[PDB]
């Protein structure tokens, strides 16, 4: 068949913070800065389009 049902190109990620080893679910195309809930450090800087990841990706949901 055809691609008539529009499906998203973005995905959710399970990343791990280097400092404290906390695992966290986050969005791939963010519009705000994403911070470690525990430490407070930034894991994903926002851009136009896809965001830059500053952590280790474990799973891509």
């Amino acid at each position: 068949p055809k691609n008539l049902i529009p499906m998203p190109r973005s995905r959710f990620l399970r990343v791990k913070c280097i400092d404290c080893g906390n695992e966290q679910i986050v969005f791939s195309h963010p519009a705000t800065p994403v911070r470690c809930l525990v430490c407070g450090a930034t894991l994903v800087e926002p851009t136009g389009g896809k965001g830059i990841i500053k952590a280790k990706v474990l799973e891509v949901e």
Binding site: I5, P6, M7, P8, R9, F12, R14, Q24, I25, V26, F27, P30, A31, T32, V34, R35, L37, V44, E61
Partner: protein, 149 residues
């Protein structure tokens, strides 16, 4: 197309046909509601609440997880705005423009923007009167609107 500019842009969201929430969602409804209330108390709007839940907590389509919307969650408490948010954003834009134009009379290209903003406000007023979210005699007037913001 755009109501004024008539340009056929398509830069929106592509949501999938979900009915049930996914399994990899950690939080539950009772936590999501508290998160909403807290982010509201810290002065955020509904759109930003949703954006933050999505980006930082991994909560897609709050309505899926909690069977109701954000404005419903906030009305169930004493936190919902008296004037809808679109109207207030537009009214703030209009107030700021009138301030600018009092100092810049002959700009003459932002007065048209002011006209367009007021047309949008009038459309929304006509809608909200019918739906009942405003009294049926509510009128926009910049004089009295200076105090709303």
């Amino acid at each position: 197309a755009r109501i004024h500019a008539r340009k056929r842009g398509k830069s929106g969201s592509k949501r999938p046909p979900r009915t049930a929430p996914p399994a990899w969602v950690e939080y539950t409804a009772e936590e999501v509601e508290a998160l909403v209330v807290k982010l509201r108390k810290e002065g955020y709007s509904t759109a930003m609440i949703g954006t933050i839940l999505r980006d930082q907590y991994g909560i897609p389509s709050v309505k899926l997880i909690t069977g109701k919307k954000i404005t419903k969650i906030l009305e169930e408490n004493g936190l919902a705005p008296e004037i809808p948010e679109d109207l207030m954003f537009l009214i703030r834009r209009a107030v700021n423009l009138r301030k600018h134009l009092e100092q810049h009379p002959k700009d003459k290209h932002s007065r048209r923007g002011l006209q367009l903003i007021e047309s949008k406000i009038r459309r929304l007023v006509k809608y909200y009167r019918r739906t009942g979210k405003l009294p049926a005699k509510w009128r926009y007037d910049p004089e009295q609107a200076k105090l709303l913001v």
